[PDB]
């Protein structure tokens, strides 16, 4: 986790490095399934979803 | 030829340093070292753990 092998012409020995934790991190585009399912039933705004399905055709 | 041999081939999958389970293929046991089966007390800690995000699958 967070380790890479650096292969290239700039190193004498291509190896694996324990990269430290960046500060601050980028945005994490991850959705957790079970916690969202654990909540009660959610209401999707069908009006908006349909108008954006039809409006964004190019 | 009257030679009672009972040899098992096992593969390490983790360590139990303290009371918590770490993974990794390290800390090779020295020869003449006891083997003590497995009890459910340590198996439960490995698998069930304690967290909200769980899912029973048998």
PDB file of N, CA, C and O in Angstrom, chain B:
ATOM      1  N   UNK B   1      10.186 -49.694   6.230  1.00  0.00           N
ATOM      2  CA  UNK B   1      11.327 -50.259   6.954  1.00  0.00           C
ATOM      3  C   UNK B   1      11.356 -49.792   8.410  1.00  0.00           C
ATOM      4  O   UNK B   1      12.391 -49.373   8.932  1.00  0.00           O
ATOM      5  N   UNK B   2      10.195 -49.873   9.067  1.00  0.00           N
ATOM      6  CA  UNK B   2      10.060 -49.576  10.496  1.00  0.00           C
ATOM      7  C   UNK B   2      10.545 -48.165  10.828  1.00  0.00           C
ATOM      8  O   UNK B   2      11.347 -47.956  11.740  1.00  0.00           O
ATOM      9  N   UNK B   3      10.044 -47.186  10.074  1.00  0.00           N
ATOM     10  CA  UNK B   3      10.411 -45.781  10.256  1.00  0.00           C
ATOM     11  C   UNK B   3       9.124 -44.957  10.260  1.00  0.00           C
ATOM     12  O   UNK B   3       8.621 -44.570   9.204  1.00  0.00           O
ATOM     13  N   UNK B   4       8.598 -44.691  11.457  1.00  0.00           N
ATOM     14  CA  UNK B   4       7.371 -43.913  11.609  1.00  0.00           C
ATOM     15  C   UNK B   4       7.645 -42.453  11.268  1.00  0.00           C
ATOM     16  O   UNK B   4       8.303 -41.743  12.036  1.00  0.00           O
ATOM     17  N   UNK B   5       7.139 -41.999  10.125  1.00  0.00           N
ATOM     18  CA  UNK B   5       7.311 -40.623   9.672  1.00  0.00           C
ATOM     19  C   UNK B   5       5.938 -39.998   9.474  1.00  0.00           C
ATOM     20  O   UNK B   5       5.084 -40.567   8.784  1.00  0.00           O
ATOM     21  N   UNK B   6       5.730 -38.831  10.081  1.00  0.00           N
ATOM     22  CA  UNK B   6       4.508 -38.042   9.917  1.00  0.00           C
ATOM     23  C   UNK B   6       4.945 -36.597   9.698  1.00  0.00           C
ATOM     24  O   UNK B   6       5.184 -35.862  10.662  1.00  0.00           O
ATOM     25  N   UNK B   7       5.050 -36.191   8.435  1.00  0.00           N
ATOM     26  CA  UNK B   7       5.589 -34.888   8.062  1.00  0.00           C
ATOM     27  C   UNK B   7       4.495 -34.081   7.378  1.00  0.00           C
ATOM     28  O   UNK B   7       3.825 -34.580   6.467  1.00  0.00           O
ATOM     29  N   UNK B   8       4.319 -32.840   7.822  1.00  0.00           N
ATOM     30  CA  UNK B   8       3.376 -31.907   7.229  1.00  0.00           C
ATOM     31  C   UNK B   8       4.124 -30.741   6.597  1.00  0.00           C
ATOM     32  O   UNK B   8       5.184 -30.329   7.075  1.00  0.00           O
ATOM     33  N   UNK B   9       3.564 -30.216   5.512  1.00  0.00           N
ATOM     34  CA  UNK B   9       4.093 -29.036   4.836  1.00  0.00           C
ATOM     35  C   UNK B   9       3.097 -27.903   5.036  1.00  0.00           C
ATOM     36  O   UNK B   9       1.990 -27.939   4.485  1.00  0.00           O
ATOM     37  N   UNK B  10       3.483 -26.904   5.822  1.00  0.00           N
ATOM     38  CA  UNK B  10       2.622 -25.768   6.109  1.00  0.00           C
ATOM     39  C   UNK B  10       3.235 -24.514   5.501  1.00  0.00           C
ATOM     40  O   UNK B  10       4.434 -24.444   5.213  1.00  0.00           O
ATOM     41  N   UNK B  11       2.384 -23.509   5.298  1.00  0.00           N
ATOM     42  CA  UNK B  11       2.794 -22.233   4.736  1.00  0.00           C
ATOM     43  C   UNK B  11       2.352 -21.120   5.676  1.00  0.00           C
ATOM     44  O   UNK B  11       1.160 -21.035   6.019  1.00  0.00           O
ATOM     45  N   UNK B  12       3.263 -20.254   6.115  1.00  0.00           N
ATOM     46  CA  UNK B  12       2.856 -19.150   6.991  1.00  0.00           C
ATOM     47  C   UNK B  12       1.988 -18.151   6.244  1.00  0.00           C
ATOM     48  O   UNK B  12       2.233 -17.832   5.079  1.00  0.00           O
ATOM     49  N   UNK B  13       0.948 -17.669   6.927  1.00  0.00           N
ATOM     50  CA  UNK B  13       0.038 -16.679   6.367  1.00  0.00           C
ATOM     51  C   UNK B  13      -0.088 -15.441   7.240  1.00  0.00           C
ATOM     52  O   UNK B  13      -0.789 -14.502   6.862  1.00  0.00           O
ATOM     53  N   UNK B  14       0.565 -15.407   8.395  1.00  0.00           N
ATOM     54  CA  UNK B  14       0.474 -14.249   9.259  1.00  0.00           C
ATOM     55  C   UNK B  14       1.236 -14.472  10.545  1.00  0.00           C
ATOM     56  O   UNK B  14       1.931 -15.476  10.713  1.00  0.00           O
ATOM     57  N   UNK B  15       1.098 -13.506  11.455  1.00  0.00           N
ATOM     58  CA  UNK B  15       1.744 -13.550  12.759  1.00  0.00           C
ATOM     59  C   UNK B  15       0.737 -13.074  13.800  1.00  0.00           C
ATOM     60  O   UNK B  15      -0.235 -12.383  13.488  1.00  0.00           O
ATOM     61  N   UNK B  16       0.974 -13.460  15.051  1.00  0.00           N
ATOM     62  CA  UNK B  16       0.099 -13.137  16.174  1.00  0.00           C
ATOM     63  C   UNK B  16       0.907 -12.455  17.278  1.00  0.00           C
ATOM     64  O   UNK B  16       0.887 -12.843  18.447  1.00  0.00           O
ATOM     65  N   UNK B  17       1.671 -11.431  16.897  1.00  0.00           N
ATOM     66  CA  UNK B  17       2.482 -10.684  17.854  1.00  0.00           C
ATOM     67  C   UNK B  17       1.569  -9.882  18.774  1.00  0.00           C
ATOM     68  O   UNK B  17       0.880  -8.959  18.330  1.00  0.00           O
ATOM     69  N   UNK B  18       1.566 -10.228  20.050  1.00  0.00           N
ATOM     70  CA  UNK B  18       0.703  -9.570  21.025  1.00  0.00           C
ATOM     71  C   UNK B  18      -0.671 -10.228  21.081  1.00  0.00           C
ATOM     72  O   UNK B  18      -0.780 -11.399  21.441  1.00  0.00           O
ATOM     73  N   UNK B  19      -1.708  -9.466  20.728  1.00  0.00           N
ATOM     74  CA  UNK B  19      -3.071  -9.984  20.659  1.00  0.00           C
ATOM     75  C   UNK B  19      -3.741  -9.620  19.340  1.00  0.00           C
ATOM     76  O   UNK B  19      -4.969  -9.706  19.230  1.00  0.00           O
ATOM     77  N   UNK B  20      -2.962  -9.219  18.338  1.00  0.00           N
ATOM     78  CA  UNK B  20      -3.489  -8.758  17.064  1.00  0.00           C
ATOM     79  C   UNK B  20      -2.734  -9.419  15.920  1.00  0.00           C
ATOM     80  O   UNK B  20      -1.549  -9.743  16.036  1.00  0.00           O
ATOM     81  N   UNK B  21      -3.443  -9.615  14.811  1.00  0.00           N
ATOM     82  CA  UNK B  21      -2.976 -10.435  13.700  1.00  0.00           C
ATOM     83  C   UNK B  21      -2.397  -9.545  12.606  1.00  0.00           C
ATOM     84  O   UNK B  21      -3.081  -8.651  12.100  1.00  0.00           O
ATOM     85  N   UNK B  22      -1.141  -9.796  12.245  1.00  0.00           N
ATOM     86  CA  UNK B  22      -0.499  -9.161  11.105  1.00  0.00           C
ATOM     87  C   UNK B  22      -0.222 -10.201  10.029  1.00  0.00           C
ATOM     88  O   UNK B  22       0.008 -11.376  10.325  1.00  0.00           O
ATOM     89  N   UNK B  23      -0.242  -9.757   8.779  1.00  0.00           N
ATOM     90  CA  UNK B  23       0.088 -10.617   7.658  1.00  0.00           C
ATOM     91  C   UNK B  23       1.560 -10.456   7.283  1.00  0.00           C
ATOM     92  O   UNK B  23       2.250  -9.543   7.741  1.00  0.00           O
ATOM     93  N   UNK B  24       2.039 -11.360   6.438  1.00  0.00           N
ATOM     94  CA  UNK B  24       3.412 -11.311   5.966  1.00  0.00           C
ATOM     95  C   UNK B  24       4.155 -12.613   6.179  1.00  0.00           C
ATOM     96  O   UNK B  24       3.888 -13.366   7.119  1.00  0.00           O
ATOM     97  N   UNK B  25       5.107 -12.886   5.286  1.00  0.00           N
ATOM     98  CA  UNK B  25       5.927 -14.095   5.353  1.00  0.00           C
ATOM     99  C   UNK B  25       7.283 -13.722   5.948  1.00  0.00           C
ATOM    100  O   UNK B  25       8.268 -13.503   5.243  1.00  0.00           O
ATOM    101  N   UNK B  26       7.325 -13.653   7.276  1.00  0.00           N
ATOM    102  CA  UNK B  26       8.538 -13.284   7.990  1.00  0.00           C
ATOM    103  C   UNK B  26       8.566 -14.020   9.323  1.00  0.00           C
ATOM    104  O   UNK B  26       7.631 -14.744   9.676  1.00  0.00           O
ATOM    105  N   UNK B  27       9.660 -13.825  10.064  1.00  0.00           N
ATOM    106  CA  UNK B  27       9.860 -14.433  11.380  1.00  0.00           C
ATOM    107  C   UNK B  27       9.787 -15.960  11.296  1.00  0.00           C
ATOM    108  O   UNK B  27       8.893 -16.602  11.852  1.00  0.00           O
ATOM    109  N   UNK B  28      10.746 -16.530  10.572  1.00  0.00           N
ATOM    110  CA  UNK B  28      10.802 -17.977  10.408  1.00  0.00           C
ATOM    111  C   UNK B  28      11.034 -18.649  11.758  1.00  0.00           C
ATOM    112  O   UNK B  28      11.975 -18.280  12.474  1.00  0.00           O
ATOM    113  N   UNK B  29      10.208 -19.619  12.144  1.00  0.00           N
ATOM    114  CA  UNK B  29      10.418 -20.293  13.431  1.00  0.00           C
ATOM    115  C   UNK B  29      11.658 -21.174  13.409  1.00  0.00           C
ATOM    116  O   UNK B  29      11.957 -21.837  12.413  1.00  0.00           O
ATOM    117  N   UNK B  30      12.375 -21.179  14.530  1.00  0.00           N
ATOM    118  CA  UNK B  30      13.564 -22.000  14.672  1.00  0.00           C
ATOM    119  C   UNK B  30      13.179 -23.476  14.780  1.00  0.00           C
ATOM    120  O   UNK B  30      12.045 -23.804  15.130  1.00  0.00           O
ATOM    121  N   UNK B  31      14.109 -24.387  14.480  1.00  0.00           N
ATOM    122  CA  UNK B  31      13.793 -25.817  14.580  1.00  0.00           C
ATOM    123  C   UNK B  31      13.494 -26.228  16.013  1.00  0.00           C
ATOM    124  O   UNK B  31      13.879 -25.562  16.976  1.00  0.00           O
ATOM    125  N   UNK B  32      12.784 -27.352  16.139  1.00  0.00           N
ATOM    126  CA  UNK B  32      12.312 -27.867  17.424  1.00  0.00           C
ATOM    127  C   UNK B  32      11.451 -26.817  18.132  1.00  0.00           C
ATOM    128  O   UNK B  32      11.774 -26.322  19.215  1.00  0.00           O
ATOM    129  N   UNK B  33      10.339 -26.474  17.482  1.00  0.00           N
ATOM    130  CA  UNK B  33       9.453 -25.430  17.963  1.00  0.00           C
ATOM    131  C   UNK B  33       8.033 -25.975  18.044  1.00  0.00           C
ATOM    132  O   UNK B  33       7.549 -26.587  17.076  1.00  0.00           O
ATOM    133  N   UNK B  34       7.329 -25.765  19.156  1.00  0.00           N
ATOM    134  CA  UNK B  34       5.999 -26.367  19.317  1.00  0.00           C
ATOM    135  C   UNK B  34       4.986 -25.868  18.294  1.00  0.00           C
ATOM    136  O   UNK B  34       5.042 -24.728  17.830  1.00  0.00           O
ATOM    137  N   UNK B  35       4.053 -26.754  17.945  1.00  0.00           N
ATOM    138  CA  UNK B  35       2.879 -26.435  17.136  1.00  0.00           C
ATOM    139  C   UNK B  35       1.646 -26.783  17.963  1.00  0.00           C
ATOM    140  O   UNK B  35       1.561 -27.884  18.519  1.00  0.00           O
ATOM    141  N   UNK B  36       0.694 -25.847  18.047  1.00  0.00           N
ATOM    142  CA  UNK B  36      -0.342 -25.912  19.073  1.00  0.00           C
ATOM    143  C   UNK B  36      -1.753 -25.861  18.487  1.00  0.00           C
ATOM    144  O   UNK B  36      -2.663 -25.321  19.122  1.00  0.00           O
ATOM    145  N   UNK B  37      -1.954 -26.417  17.287  1.00  0.00           N
ATOM    146  CA  UNK B  37      -3.263 -26.412  16.641  1.00  0.00           C
ATOM    147  C   UNK B  37      -3.807 -24.993  16.523  1.00  0.00           C
ATOM    148  O   UNK B  37      -3.027 -24.040  16.494  1.00  0.00           O
ATOM    149  N   UNK B  38      -5.126 -24.835  16.449  1.00  0.00           N
ATOM    150  CA  UNK B  38      -5.763 -23.521  16.472  1.00  0.00           C
ATOM    151  C   UNK B  38      -7.015 -23.598  17.335  1.00  0.00           C
ATOM    152  O   UNK B  38      -7.777 -24.566  17.255  1.00  0.00           O
ATOM    153  N   UNK B  39      -7.223 -22.578  18.164  1.00  0.00           N
ATOM    154  CA  UNK B  39      -8.439 -22.441  18.950  1.00  0.00           C
ATOM    155  C   UNK B  39      -9.340 -21.378  18.331  1.00  0.00           C
ATOM    156  O   UNK B  39      -8.874 -20.470  17.639  1.00  0.00           O
ATOM    157  N   UNK B  40     -10.644 -21.509  18.582  1.00  0.00           N
ATOM    158  CA  UNK B  40     -11.607 -20.563  18.027  1.00  0.00           C
ATOM    159  C   UNK B  40     -11.409 -19.143  18.550  1.00  0.00           C
ATOM    160  O   UNK B  40     -11.835 -18.187  17.890  1.00  0.00           O
ATOM    161  N   UNK B  41     -10.765 -18.988  19.710  1.00  0.00           N
ATOM    162  CA  UNK B  41     -10.595 -17.664  20.299  1.00  0.00           C
ATOM    163  C   UNK B  41      -9.753 -16.753  19.409  1.00  0.00           C
ATOM    164  O   UNK B  41     -10.055 -15.562  19.269  1.00  0.00           O
ATOM    165  N   UNK B  42      -8.688 -17.289  18.803  1.00  0.00           N
ATOM    166  CA  UNK B  42      -7.856 -16.500  17.898  1.00  0.00           C
ATOM    167  C   UNK B  42      -8.445 -16.414  16.488  1.00  0.00           C
ATOM    168  O   UNK B  42      -8.310 -15.374  15.823  1.00  0.00           O
ATOM    169  N   UNK B  43      -9.143 -17.456  16.038  1.00  0.00           N
ATOM    170  CA  UNK B  43      -9.798 -17.434  14.734  1.00  0.00           C
ATOM    171  C   UNK B  43     -10.879 -16.361  14.668  1.00  0.00           C
ATOM    172  O   UNK B  43     -11.016 -15.674  13.646  1.00  0.00           O
ATOM    173  N   UNK B  44     -11.661 -16.214  15.744  1.00  0.00           N
ATOM    174  CA  UNK B  44     -12.689 -15.178  15.779  1.00  0.00           C
ATOM    175  C   UNK B  44     -12.075 -13.791  15.674  1.00  0.00           C
ATOM    176  O   UNK B  44     -12.605 -12.922  14.973  1.00  0.00           O
ATOM    177  N   UNK B  45     -10.958 -13.562  16.368  1.00  0.00           N
ATOM    178  CA  UNK B  45     -10.293 -12.268  16.266  1.00  0.00           C
ATOM    179  C   UNK B  45      -9.809 -12.011  14.850  1.00  0.00           C
ATOM    180  O   UNK B  45      -9.892 -10.882  14.351  1.00  0.00           O
ATOM    181  N   UNK B  46      -9.295 -13.038  14.176  1.00  0.00           N
ATOM    182  CA  UNK B  46      -8.854 -12.841  12.794  1.00  0.00           C
ATOM    183  C   UNK B  46     -10.028 -12.482  11.888  1.00  0.00           C
ATOM    184  O   UNK B  46      -9.938 -11.547  11.086  1.00  0.00           O
ATOM    185  N   UNK B  47     -11.139 -13.212  11.993  1.00  0.00           N
ATOM    186  CA  UNK B  47     -12.202 -13.055  10.997  1.00  0.00           C
ATOM    187  C   UNK B  47     -13.284 -12.050  11.398  1.00  0.00           C
ATOM    188  O   UNK B  47     -13.514 -11.068  10.686  1.00  0.00           O
ATOM    189  N   UNK B  48     -13.962 -12.287  12.522  1.00  0.00           N
ATOM    190  CA  UNK B  48     -15.090 -11.437  12.892  1.00  0.00           C
ATOM    191  C   UNK B  48     -14.648 -10.001  13.151  1.00  0.00           C
ATOM    192  O   UNK B  48     -15.285  -9.051  12.680  1.00  0.00           O
ATOM    193  N   UNK B  49     -13.553  -9.828  13.885  1.00  0.00           N
ATOM    194  CA  UNK B  49     -13.040  -8.508  14.279  1.00  0.00           C
ATOM    195  C   UNK B  49     -14.157  -7.763  15.017  1.00  0.00           C
ATOM    196  O   UNK B  49     -14.994  -8.382  15.688  1.00  0.00           O
ATOM    197  N   UNK B  50     -14.182  -6.433  14.909  1.00  0.00           N
ATOM    198  CA  UNK B  50     -15.244  -5.640  15.527  1.00  0.00           C
ATOM    199  C   UNK B  50     -15.350  -4.326  14.752  1.00  0.00           C
ATOM    200  O   UNK B  50     -14.535  -3.423  14.953  1.00  0.00           O
ATOM    201  N   UNK B  51     -16.353  -4.235  13.882  1.00  0.00           N
ATOM    202  CA  UNK B  51     -16.552  -3.040  13.075  1.00  0.00           C
ATOM    203  C   UNK B  51     -17.980  -3.050  12.548  1.00  0.00           C
ATOM    204  O   UNK B  51     -18.623  -4.100  12.467  1.00  0.00           O
ATOM    205  N   UNK B  52     -18.478  -1.857  12.206  1.00  0.00           N
ATOM    206  CA  UNK B  52     -19.836  -1.740  11.681  1.00  0.00           C
ATOM    207  C   UNK B  52     -19.973  -2.421  10.323  1.00  0.00           C
ATOM    208  O   UNK B  52     -20.992  -3.065  10.048  1.00  0.00           O
ATOM    209  N   UNK B  53     -18.966  -2.292   9.461  1.00  0.00           N
ATOM    210  CA  UNK B  53     -19.032  -2.829   8.102  1.00  0.00           C
ATOM    211  C   UNK B  53     -18.685  -4.314   8.140  1.00  0.00           C
ATOM    212  O   UNK B  53     -17.534  -4.716   7.959  1.00  0.00           O
ATOM    213  N   UNK B  54     -19.701  -5.143   8.380  1.00  0.00           N
ATOM    214  CA  UNK B  54     -19.555  -6.592   8.374  1.00  0.00           C
ATOM    215  C   UNK B  54     -20.681  -7.194   7.546  1.00  0.00           C
ATOM    216  O   UNK B  54     -21.710  -6.563   7.295  1.00  0.00           O
ATOM    217  N   UNK B  55     -20.471  -8.438   7.122  1.00  0.00           N
ATOM    218  CA  UNK B  55     -21.459  -9.151   6.317  1.00  0.00           C
ATOM    219  C   UNK B  55     -21.285 -10.643   6.562  1.00  0.00           C
ATOM    220  O   UNK B  55     -20.242 -11.210   6.223  1.00  0.00           O
ATOM    221  N   UNK B  56     -22.301 -11.273   7.144  1.00  0.00           N
ATOM    222  CA  UNK B  56     -22.250 -12.704   7.405  1.00  0.00           C
ATOM    223  C   UNK B  56     -22.442 -13.482   6.109  1.00  0.00           C
ATOM    224  O   UNK B  56     -23.414 -13.263   5.380  1.00  0.00           O
ATOM    225  N   UNK B  57     -21.513 -14.390   5.821  1.00  0.00           N
ATOM    226  CA  UNK B  57     -21.579 -15.213   4.617  1.00  0.00           C
ATOM    227  C   UNK B  57     -21.190 -16.651   4.957  1.00  0.00           C
ATOM    228  O   UNK B  57     -20.450 -17.313   4.226  1.00  0.00           O
ATOM    229  N   UNK B  58     -21.674 -17.147   6.086  1.00  0.00           N
ATOM    230  CA  UNK B  58     -21.485 -18.532   6.459  1.00  0.00           C
ATOM    231  C   UNK B  58     -20.460 -18.721   7.560  1.00  0.00           C
ATOM    232  O   UNK B  58     -20.115 -17.800   8.305  1.00  0.00           O
TER     233      UNK B  58
END
